[PDB]
Design a protein around this ligand. Structure first.
Ligand SMILES: Nc1ccn([C@@H]2O[C@H](COP(=O)(O)OP(=O)(O)OP(=O)(O)O)[C@@H](O)[C@H]2O)c(=O)n1
Ligand SMILES: Nc1ccn([C@@H]2O[C@H](COP(=O)(O)OP(=O)(O)OP(=O)(O)O)[C@@H](O)[C@H]2O)c(=O)n1
Ligand SMILES: [Mg+2]
Ligand SMILES: [Mg+2]
Lengths: 221, 222
């Protein structure tokens, strides 16, 4: 079985809409509901735990809450929100951590991440070739190097894990700042396997990204 | 003089339109015309050299040829196209190499690149922190490491250079694979300075990208 943990507790500062980003609409439906729909449509998710902004917990339990759909208060940062949500994950052998902000993630991608876990990988992350050339820079913006593009991946969510591995990794988390779950698992020396991602699993962060997402939804309508 | 070189001689295989990408329309206008419009709006570009597929050289001179724009036949790959365009740049102080596919590149971004060159940087590239976490992977796609995202930039165009530095680099360029001009200059350890890019300067590559570009254009047109 697979449980999805959905961090949806951020304030959406960069989205500029005056409300937490999970509750901004896309085609008239909140981003959170899009993310939940993708998870349910994949057919491979047995349980969902959603971390929401703390003040909205009670209202969220009423709107989004249900038997296989558990609301928890989120934390100060994404790492804390995921840690809190893991307390409610239950006994599923696999955990997928999926940003509510990646609202148009295709159910296909979710299914592929679970399939790779079931195959035997302990940690599975979707990734794509970076669209732009990546350069390493120093603190003043001077280029230090241009890593080989073929060996880089821009990663997305859901990031999938054997549950025991993810719990171990989060039990070692310190201070936060990290918003990539795989990084915590890498610190245990657990192998992390990249699988093909999907350009539609982009993270909605700014008003431009929402314009883009509206365009995608309208084009696939 | 600041000269922009625009390689536009590619076939656009990944756009899957069956015709060269720079001539595919966006909002009723070829990507190339959008890119030229941005360069002109910046008010910092003196002239432009455009490399186009040899077949379309004559037509292109009629459509895009101008008092400030010269059309030349491009090459089999981007590197050759840039080299051929450099032949026609004249006595430039600065050369900016700009991908026509980044059709919605803001003029302020173009001006930032030129401004930094005038400050005395030999090589200047626009960039932003990557929107996604970047991982290094081995041949099987297993993670080798996660570089500090804050120390990475996803770079864009125009890439700006002191003309002599770029010309010396292009003299020893290898044909094929090389589509980041700064990388060529980096081979010698020439310093390259990042200036702020802009999410609008995305490279139109796929059918999806073009759908997105149409939507951006519509959004900003009131
Ligand atoms: N304290 C937090 C911060 C973030 N998130 C979640 O982590 C995902 C990725 O975060 P991000 O895209 O940064 O969203 P926000 O933090 O809401 O946006 P911003 O950083 O612009 O304020 C989002 O689904 C967000 O709701 C969370 O659950 N708890
Ligand atoms: N032989 C070539 C190949 C590419 N370019 C130019 O370089 C820019 C970036 O290249 P890319 O986005 O890869 O465009 P294409 O090569 O046309 O697309 P594809 O690789 O999908 O065929 C484009 O403006 C393109 O016209 C060029 O001048 N000469
Ligand atoms: Mg955030
Ligand atoms: Mg190409």
């Amino acid at each position: 079985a697979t449980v999805a943990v959905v961090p949806a507790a951020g304030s959406g500062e960069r989205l500029r809409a005056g409300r937490p980003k999970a509750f901004v609409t896309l085609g008239g439906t909140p981003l959170l509901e899009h993310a939940l729909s993708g998870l349910r449509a994949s057919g491979v998710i047995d349980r969902i735990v959603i971390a929401v902004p703390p003040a909205l917990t009670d209202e969220s339990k009423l709107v989004f809450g249900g038997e296989d759909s558990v609301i928890v208060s989120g934390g100060v940062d994404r790492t804390e929100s995921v840690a809190l949500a893991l307390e409610a994950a239950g006994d599923a052998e696999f955990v997928l951590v999926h940003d509510a902000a990646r609202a148009l993630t295709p159910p296909a991608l979710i299914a592929r991440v679970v399939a790779a876990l079931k195959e035997g990988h302990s940690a599975v992350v979707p990734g794509l070739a970076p669209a732009d050339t990546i350069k390493a820079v120093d603190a003043n913006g001077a280029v230090l190097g241009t890593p080989e593009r073929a060996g880089l991946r821009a990663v997305q969510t859901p990031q999938g894990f054997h549950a025991d591995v993810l719990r171990r990794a989060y039990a070692r988390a310190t201070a936060g700042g990290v918003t990539d779950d795989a990084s915590l698992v890498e610190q245990l020396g657990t192998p992390v396997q990249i699988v093909d991602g999907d350009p539609l699993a982009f993270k909605i962060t700014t008003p431009l990204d929402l314009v883009l997402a509206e365009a995608v939804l309208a084009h696939h309508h």
